[PDB]
Structures are given as C-alpha cells and as structure tokens.
Amino acid sequence: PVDVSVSIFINKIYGVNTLEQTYKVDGYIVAQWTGKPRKTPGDKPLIVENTQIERWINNGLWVPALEFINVVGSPDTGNKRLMLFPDGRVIYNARFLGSFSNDMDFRLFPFDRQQFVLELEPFSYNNQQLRFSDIQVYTENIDNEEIDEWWIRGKASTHISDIRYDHLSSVQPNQNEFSRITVRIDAVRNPSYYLWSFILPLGLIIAASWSVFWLESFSERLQTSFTLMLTVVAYAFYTSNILGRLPYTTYIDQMIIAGYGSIFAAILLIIFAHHRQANGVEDDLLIQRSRLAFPLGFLAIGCVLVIRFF
C-alpha cells in the first residue's frame, strides 16, 4: 500500500442554505505522498501547473483522483498544481470550491449547534494500494469570526474512517473498502436576529391581546381580539421562510401555537361569559378574574419548556 499525507486549508465558509440543506466551502487541497525518485533540472523541485499536468500523466505519472462524497454537483476546481521532487515525493495542489450538503437537526432552532462535515475519498484506489496517513487542518482565516448568521467555536475535529463499499463485490471481491477523510467544523447560531425581530413584536401582540381583557364593552372585546387572532394566525409561515417543510416544531412554532391556544381560549371564555349572561345584564366576575393568575400560568408553561428542553 501507498501512504498519503493530506493537508487541508479552508478559505471561507458561506452560503449556508438550510432550505436546501447546503453550504459552500472555499479552500485548497494539498496531497503529499512518496514514490520512486527521479531526475529534475537543477536540485530544485519542478513546478508543473495546469494544462501541463496532463502531459506528465500521459508520460506515465501516477496521480490518483481524490473526490468528495458529500457534494452536490461537482467541486468547482480552479487551478491545479503538481509539485515534483527528485528524491521521490509527489505533491498535488488544487483549489476546490464545493457546495456541501449534510444532515441537520433543527429541534432547538434559535439556539442550535451544528457542524460542517467534509468527506473525501479516492475514486478507485482502496487502502491496500492507497492509504491516507494523516491530516493536519489549517483554519486561520475563519478561526474566530462570525459567519453571517453562525458563530464558529474552536478548532476542527478530524478523523479518518475506513468504510466498506459492497457494490464492488462483483468486480473486486475481497478488497473493496475505502479510506475516507472526515473533517468536522463546529458551528453555533447567533440567536440575536430572531430575538430582536420576531419574539419581540409577537410579545407586544400577545401583551395587547391580553390587555383587551381590561375593556368594558362587548364589541371592543370581540372585534379587536378577532383581528389580533387572525394576524397571529398569519404568522404561522415564518418557520417555512427560513427552514424547509420540517416535520417537527421549534421555539417559534411552539410559542406561536401557545399564543393560538391563549387567544382561542380567551375568545371561547368571552363567548361562554356572554352565554352565562342570561338576561344580558347579569354580570360575571369570576370568568374575567384571570387577569393576574393565568399570565403567571403562561409564563409557567414557558419556563417549564425552557427548563425541561434546555
């Protein structure tokens, strides 16, 4: 087998698209490995750039292709560099730019923690003939800085894994498992946008929809609460704006459903109160006396969700 040493440089991470579960990675790929010695002009290694590497491959150079597994489309390679040493180590450099896609789990969406994964494999050389020795990661341009809505934490977590591909069994019986390089880039979201943008105006709308309880006329109790109920229902599709069509709820989702329950229970309580007014002049007191206990109850449900879910 042949040892391979890979060094990775990450330029910038951008274009994180939760709707399509994609994100874009910029950087360079450097693969170092050792072969037979050769002769170079001078005692200095040879520089072979693009539209000249193919000529040396046609001469008989062995340059394996190292693909990326978790990409959509094709890695948009730029220039590519081949470095040839007389002593017998061959170094291939290229600038990738890939649109990477991976699984994400949005349970606690405003305060979520994700990771970016990079999965690299040789295309046709198994570890019995091409082994990845080690990788050292270079993340310094994005080491501690904020992506447009995500914060970065710490260094990269890396691992090389060996995975079996059963679909080569008819064409390569026993040696069909591949050395795979896996790199993790941890990332945490900034809650700040949603905190100043949605949970605040919703908070004011909930407060006004509670303050409607202090009124003393029936039309003011119903019509304003109805308009507020419909406009609160109109904010159901905020999660679908940023995220996909997720089968599970978030804090915005759970909060807005709790708001729905509050306003619907309020309008049912008012209707039941008027139905208890048999003559239209007998006044109930206990049924609107909930101005101070149930706000503590709603904050209690909120703090139970906060304590248990965190």
Place this chain on the structure above:
Amino acid sequence: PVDVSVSIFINKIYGVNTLEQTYKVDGYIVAQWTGKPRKTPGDKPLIVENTQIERWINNGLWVPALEFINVVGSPDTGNKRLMLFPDGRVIYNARFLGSFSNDMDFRLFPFDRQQFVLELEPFSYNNQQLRFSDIQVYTENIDNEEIDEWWIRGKASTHISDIRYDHLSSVQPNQNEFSRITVRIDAVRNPSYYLWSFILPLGLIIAASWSVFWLESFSERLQTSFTLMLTVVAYAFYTSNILGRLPYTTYIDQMIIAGYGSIFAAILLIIFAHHRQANGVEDDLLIQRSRLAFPLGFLAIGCVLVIRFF
C-alpha cells in the same frame, strides 16, 4: 449479442421539486461485461482513470455510452473509471448526478405514496449487439432514513424492459428495439408538517367562525364573519405554493372549499334570518338552532370523504 451486467449504487436522493416534477439522484454507475482477453502489466488488472480512457478508446477499445432517458439537462458526471482485466472482462465506472423527472399523481396529497424511477438505455447499441444481463441494486446509505419531507419504504424494485423505437426504421429496418433498465424507489410522504401547520389553524378559524353563531348582536354576527370569510378565501393559494397549477383538488383544497361553503351558507342564513324579521323585532329560533346538528353534519361530510376516499 453481448451480455452486460450493471450494478447500481445510490448515494442520496434530494431536491424533490413537485413544482417542476423533478428530483436529484446521486450515485455511481458500474457496468461489467466480457470481451476478448488481453495482456496487462503483472497479473493485476489495469487502472485507467479519466483523461486516459479516451486514449484507450482511440487505441480501439469498445466502450459503449449508456445514457439515461428520463433526465432533464445532462447527467453531471464526475470522475470516470475504466477497469481492464487480462482475462477479458471490461468494467466501466463513473459517478453520475442527474436531475430526474417523471410523472406524479397528487390525488391524496397529504398522505401520498410515490416512486422514483431511473430509466437507462444504451445510446446506439440494440440488444442484438448489447444485452443487459441483470442488475443488483445497492441502496444502503438511504435504506431506512427520512428525506426532508419523504419517507423511504423497503428495497428497490427493478425490471429490465425491451422497448421499440420506431424512428430508426428508415436507418435500421428490423433491429431497432433497445434494452432498458428500469429501477423503482418507493417513497411515502410524511403528513406531519401540514398536520401541525395548516389543518390546525384552519381548524381554529372554522371553530371561531362557528362560535360567531352564539352572539346576540347583528353587527358582531356580520362583520367578524365577513372578515373571517375573506381571510379564509385568502388561503386558497396554499396548494399552488408547494404544488403546481394542478387540474384536480386535494384534501386541503376539498377542506377549504367545504369551509367556503360553511361560511357562505352561514352568511346567507343570517341575511335570510334578518329578512324574515319583518318588523325588526320579531325573533326567529329555528334558523339559528343549527348549533349542534350541522357540526355533526360537517364532521359527517368529512368522515364520508375520509372513509370513501381512503
């Protein structure tokens, strides 16, 4: 004729676009077939990667092109591998990534069951000179896991079909039918998103638009019901958001039209009730007595649609 053995690996299915009737498939193609024996260096098969397969084709190697029928655009191939055995079997490997399009039928949209089809054909070699022997499918990375709004069930269903192309009749009279590989990937949707997102707030709006019947003043009976009627009409275009401009209705569509009928019959009943008030003080009882029977009627229409349609 020449036998061909194809083994298929499916990496991931994503980007299911019901609006354009497209979906994206990642994976690898492996075609195995047997020809004349040859000479290789060593007793080990030769590895010929990209920008070197064309040289061996120019040497006289017979590598047929196996296209995909049901794609939009072109399959975005990546690297391609040619495996050459001295004993006389030639194995071609390539990584496809295609945007696949096929028919879909959205009668029962929230609870629908679809399948993904892959249709492959050689470009110019009929089965009298190129026969597909068999295919074995490899679906393990996506064997039992949820696509972003679709669930996967079971293994792949495969079939090889032989179809006649009449447009080669002027250029190839009798032998113009092609061996086609067909692979089915069954998929079932998750109703969960729409269940928590749309049928619930619509349910609360219908319940409030019914609870308006318990009021005792004319302006409250009309104005709130009118605003609720217009906002219920405003949710007509929800199906057009996810789906296309379909000629047929769904459960959201049938439910929202039933809601339209309920609110329009309610407002007509209220107007007819006031017209029966000849003096403006004579009160009707039978015309608003439908508070308990017609909700059972609406649930009856719903359960009839549920029982008969399922």
Place this chain on the structure above:
Amino acid sequence: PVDVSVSIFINKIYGVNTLEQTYKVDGYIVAQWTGKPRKTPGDKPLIVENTQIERWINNGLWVPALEFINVVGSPDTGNKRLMLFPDGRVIYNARFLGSFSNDMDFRLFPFDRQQFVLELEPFSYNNQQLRFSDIQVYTENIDNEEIDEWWIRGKASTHISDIRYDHLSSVQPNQNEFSRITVRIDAVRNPSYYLWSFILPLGLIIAASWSVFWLESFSERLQTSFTLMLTVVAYAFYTSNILGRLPYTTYIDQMIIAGYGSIFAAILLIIFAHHRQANGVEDDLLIQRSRLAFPLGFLAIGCVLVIRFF
C-alpha cells in the same frame, strides 16, 4: 445539391414558461443523407460514437451542422452518433435538449389554444448544396397525454420552408436562401385549475358583495362593502403572477374589472341614496329596488362577452 432526410423524435415537452415565453423540448435528431460509397470492416455499418466523430471529420468526412433558430442559449446536446454505411449513406444521430421560445397570443387565456414550433436550419449550407428532402415525425411518448397544464391534440403539423437571408449578400451574392424545417405541435390548455381556484372564490365574493344590499343599517352597508371592495382590488395582480406584463386583458381581467364596476357603482348608489335622504329619515325605495334586475344585467353582460368573444 445534396438531399437530406431528417427524422425527428420528441421525448417530452415540459417547462412551459409563459412569463419568459419559453418551453423545453427533449428528443433526438436523426439526419440521413447519401454520399459516395466507402469501405467498412465486414458488411455491417460502422458505429462511431462521441469523441471519435471528430477524428473522422479530421479524416475528411463532410458532416454539416444543423442548428435550431428559435432557441434561447444553446441546445444542450448529449451524446452524438455517426452511422457510416459502405454503400454511401451517412447517418448522424444526436440527443438535443433545447429551451425553445416563440410568440404567443393570450386573448382568451383560460381557454387558449397554442402551438409549439421547432425551427431548424443548416448553419452555412444553402439548398443549392444541401437540400432537405422530407421529414417524418415521431411523437408517441407524448401522443395523447396531459402536460402539467396543457393538453395535446392530434399529430404534428410539419412544413419545410425556404427563407432568404439578405445578410449574406456581401459574402454570397445570389445563393443565400436556406432550407428550413418547421414542425408544429398543437396544444390546448386545461381551464380546470382556474375554474376551481379563482373564478369560484371571486364568485362567492361577488355574491356576498351583492347580498350586502339586503341589510338595513348604514354602517353595515358601507364598511363591509368597503372592505370587500379593497380586497377585490387586491386581486388585480393574479394575471401578472402567471403571465407577463401583457398590454391586453383576459377573462379574469375583464371579469375583475366588471366586479370593480359593480362594487364602485354600488357604493356610489348608496352614497347618492343617503344624499337623497334630506332629513335622514325619508326612505328611498327605487334606489335599492335593483336587487333582481341588475343581477340579470350583470349575467347579461357576462353572456354577451361569452357569446361574442367565443
């Protein structure tokens, strides 16, 4: 001159974009023509696939380029096949996929009938040296089936036309007119989507905006009619959603303007009625007596438009 026989296969029509006046066509191109005889291995015609046709062109083969006139961008060709017969007929096959654009006329939009046109020309060979003999069309996969909002009727209508290009006059004086292949694919829209989706809720809104005439209080006559008037105005941009910024009106457009006239005349009639109430207690009868005659009038305007326009 040289005869050319072209046979066309159409795979599927999709992606009809009325906003950009584009549509996508899938299929294969087959051009058959006769030249000088040659020598082949065996008595069987030679199969020359892609990345090998260029070598035979460099050998001295005459393969003309047959472009498409009415495309946007470039035809996304796939594989291409060259068929070489010893007796002297050369057959070129390729899989096109083009985004085709042509004129459309949307006078009667919900019930419109269009056609898809395919315009093909050789790039540089006039009919004095390259003549199109005939074409036979192959439309069987889409022969009788519904495109996502269009129905297909009958077979293809074809014609070969000879058109003069005056811009070669400085470079080719007398022989500058080109043989052009024209294929028509008739298509009719399905009215069903718009029939269940827009003309129905608009019908209910118009009916409610008429039923407001049966009320007996001024505020109920004005405020509800005003809200309904503004929401009917809000549906002006439905045509701009599907279609472009058309200089002419459709049935949705004419219907919604008729609705505008109805609601604006109604609110002016109510204001004029209240102005005729000099003391605020004198009641008019003739000015609201139009509950039964003018609905017949509005249906009369509708049926006049239906009878005359159809």
Place this chain on the structure above:
Amino acid sequence: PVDVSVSIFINKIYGVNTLEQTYKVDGYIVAQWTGKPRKTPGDKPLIVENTQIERWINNGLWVPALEFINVVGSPDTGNKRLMLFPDGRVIYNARFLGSFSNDMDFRLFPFDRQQFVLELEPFSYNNQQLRFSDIQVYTENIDNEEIDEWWIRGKASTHISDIRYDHLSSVQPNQNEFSRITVRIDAVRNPSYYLWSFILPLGLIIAASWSVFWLESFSERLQTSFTLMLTVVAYAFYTSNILGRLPYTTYIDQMIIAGYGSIFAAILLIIFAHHRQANGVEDDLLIQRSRLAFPLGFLAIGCVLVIRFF
C-alpha cells in the same frame, strides 16, 4: 492597417430586465476582410466549420478575436463559420447570444423611450493594424413588432467610434486606441399594462376615499378613511417590483405620494373639524365645503405635472 467590413444580423431581442439593467440579444456576426490570395480546391470558396477553424489557425491563418464590451458574463457563441476565398478575402461567421447591459434613465417610466446599444471591439488589434471600414445592419425579423412590453421604432442607428485605452501605455506607448463599433436600437415602452392595471384601481380607491366626505357619521368618516389610507400606503412598493431601488420618483410614485397627501390632509381636516366642535353639537360648514373645489385642485396639480413634465 487592415480594413474590416462587418455585417450584423439581429435575430430577436428578449429578456429585458430593468431590475438588473440587462437584456438579451440573439443574432449572427459576420466579419469580412481582405488578405493575401491563396489556393482552394476548385474555383469555389472553402467551407471550414467548427472544430476545424482551429486547425487552420494552427496552420498560420490570422483570425482576430472581436469581443463585445458591454456584456455580462461571456457571449454564448454557438457554431462558428470560416469562409475562405482563393482571391484573398476571409470571412468569419459566428452565432452570438449575449446578455447586454447598459445605462437606463427612468424619469418618465410609464411613457419612457430607451435604446439598446451594442459595443464591439477587437481584443488586441488597434486601428493601425485592424480598421473597421463600415457596417450595414440587418433588422428584419424584429423590424416592426412588439417585444413583450416594448415597441420598436425605425431602423438601427449605427456609428463607429475610436476610443483611447490608457492602460496599454506601459505596454504599447503611442498606438493604444481601438476601433469600436456602436449600434443603437431605439425602443419605446407600451403604457397599456400599467394604464389598465394600476392607475385604474388606484383611481377608484382615490374616488372612494373622496366619496367618504359625503357621509354624516363620525365613525364612518374615520374608520373607512383609515383603512383606505393604510391600503394606499401598502401600494408603495409597486415601483420596486418592476424597477430597482431607484433614487428618483416616477408617475406612479408621484401619483401615489399625491394620494398620500390627499388622504392625510383629509384626515387632518376631519380631526381639526371635530376639534372645532367645542360642544360636540356645533356643526361646521366651511371645512367640508371643499367637495367640488379641491377635486379641481387635485386635477389641476395632475395637469400641471402632465403639461410641465411632458
């Protein structure tokens, strides 16, 4: 210097995008020029198509590259034709398709007049070694017909200009000015869409918001005028839909701001009128007597803008 004769054919203009200031042009490029005589087979000029022009360039043919200046991206060339005459004139043909971008000035947007400009330059040959003799334009397929929202007027206006490029001064001291071909295609918009689509419903809304002055109750004067004021404010973003984020106003913009002034002055006048009602029963007459003079005033402001601006 070398004379060059260019003849231009324009196929169709489409995809005019005011938001990105782009438009798409289809057509062919024909460049005719005279060089040294040569030998051809027969007495007939040689036809050299694509993937064969490069071989003759490698033979020593001088084919300059004629780029387009005002494009975004790259001109999507199709086939390219080289015509070789024995007498010594070389004719290059190619089918371009470019996305062209240029300045536009939207002062009087609904009734605007623009022009399409085509700017062509050789890439590296100045007029001391490559001179453009003349151009004759061929616009017949689009000579008098309507683009989807633009009308075409007259023939093309052309000019060849010689412009200095100062950035070659370090590499070519004295001879660094380039012969540039400039073609103008005048175009005028059709006001019809906006005339039937926006200025009409806005006209009805303004008329209703004036007709609110004829009412006799305070709540009807305020609430309806408030809802109409907010929905008129809601139509502020119509210009941003079609156009960009322009620093200057249009007729829709000026009209909607005039509407804003009318409704805001009306609501301030009503509030001031009620404040002049000291006892709540004393009635003002002069403050609502403006039903007939200020509509003439608003039409006067409109006709002043029409007369002065046109």
Place this chain on the structure above:
Amino acid sequence: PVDVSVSIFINKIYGVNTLEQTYKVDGYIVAQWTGKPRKTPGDKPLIVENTQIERWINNGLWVPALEFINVVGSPDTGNKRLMLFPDGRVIYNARFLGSFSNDMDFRLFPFDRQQFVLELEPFSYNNQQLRFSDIQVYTENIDNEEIDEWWIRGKASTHISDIRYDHLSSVQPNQNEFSRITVRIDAVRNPSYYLWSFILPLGLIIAASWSVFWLESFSERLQTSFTLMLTVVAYAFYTSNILGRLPYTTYIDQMIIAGYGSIFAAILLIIFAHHRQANGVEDDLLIQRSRLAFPLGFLAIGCVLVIRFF
C-alpha cells in the same frame, strides 16, 4: 526573484448583492514582466491570442497563473492575450469577470460607506521567485458616476501585501509567503430611495397614530390605533428584504422599534385611563395632556440618536 508589473483596468461594477455579500467586477488584467530575450519575426512584437498560448507554453514558455482570492466560483475569463517582445519582456493580457465577496458592516445602513476589495495572488510562485513590483490602477469609465444604488468617491486605494501561508510548511519549509495585490474601491450609498420610499409613509403613519389622541370616543381611540399598531408591526421585515438576517439593528430598525414603543405605550395609557374611570363618566385630563410634550420627547430621542450615532 522575478519582478512583475501589473496594470489593472476596471470596466464596470454592478450586481452588488448585500443578501449574499457579493458584487460583480468587469475589467481586464495586464501583467508585465521581464525575462530572457528571444527572436521574433520582424522587429515588431508577436501577437499570440487564445488557443495558441497553450502551444507556446508547451514550447517551454513560463506563464504563471495569477488567481484571485476573494472570489466565489471561478473568474469567468474571456479571451486571453500574450504579448511577446524580442528584447525579453513578456506581457499577458486577459479579460476577467469575477463575482467578488467580502465583509461588510451595516451599522448605519441608510448612510453607509463601503469599499470594494480585489485580492490577487499567484497560485504557486512565492516572492522569492515571483515578486510584484508595482500596480497602477485605471478607473475612468466608472471614475465619477452612480452605480444603481451606490455613489463612487475618489480614486482607487492600492497596496501590495505579503502574507504567510502556513499550510505549505510540510511541502515548502521556509519560503511559503505570497505577494498579494490588494485594491480598494471606496463606495458610498445614496440615501435617497429609502428617504422617499419608507421613512416618509412611516412618518405619516406615526403622525396619524398620534392624531388619534384628539378623538373623543372610546371605540375610535382603540380600533384605529389597534389596526395602525398591527400594520406598523407588519413592516418589521423591510430590513430582511434588502439585507440578510443581521444580528444588529439599523436606523429603519431603531425607528420602527421606537414606533412600536410609542404605539404600545399609547394603547397602555388609554387602557390605564379607562381603568382610572371608576364610574365610566369621570374624565381624566392629565393622562391625555401629553399631546405637545411627548412629540418633543420623541423628536428628542430621534435627535439624540442622530447626534450621538453620527
């Protein structure tokens, strides 16, 4: 080391996308450097255009690749020119078109000042073998003119920087720092669009929501203020339209939150006023006496933000 002189021409800047933090740059690249002398036909330098530069590279010409660091995707190069002098200076010309991305800081968004940065580096040649001598910038076509929402100020600010790349340490121990060309293009936004488009209608809405204080009936004080409050809340997402999901607020954001505070404090003050009405007939004076002091207070908060923030 080898000196390199680079001259840059900028054609046009367009497509500034704050949502994706991208912008597009058009222009040409010219690199001048001196090598060994050679022989040319005549005493005039040789013109080598595209699809001929690669042949001279294969002959043994040393043409380094000068990439751009801060691009997304790949620079869409057009034609490329090589200029060869007999005396020994080699000049490479090419037309780039890149989508450039860089950091932006939107604290004071309507009145912001940004700069466009261009970062260029050789791909594999460090300054010990390739040194950038100097750069002279050519910005004349866009020297003083307005980009579609940005104004340009002054000349370009340029600097050449030398940056260490630690990821070549395993492959090149001591000499791994690269000469980088950095060009700054200062740009200032035009506040005019937002000034006439959003801060004006919001100003009228705030003025009407203040003028509601002059009314004398409870329903008019509540219902209109409630509808205005909800529609003011509805304009929260204006910043998200142009900008991204920013963690920090702007002047539109701070102004709209101040409006939220004004309307919510107003509705709470009205509710508290009615609660102070113990009998429903006792009238408060001090609680609505804030018609003249708190508008001065709101303008005071605005002018404090204006003075301190500027």
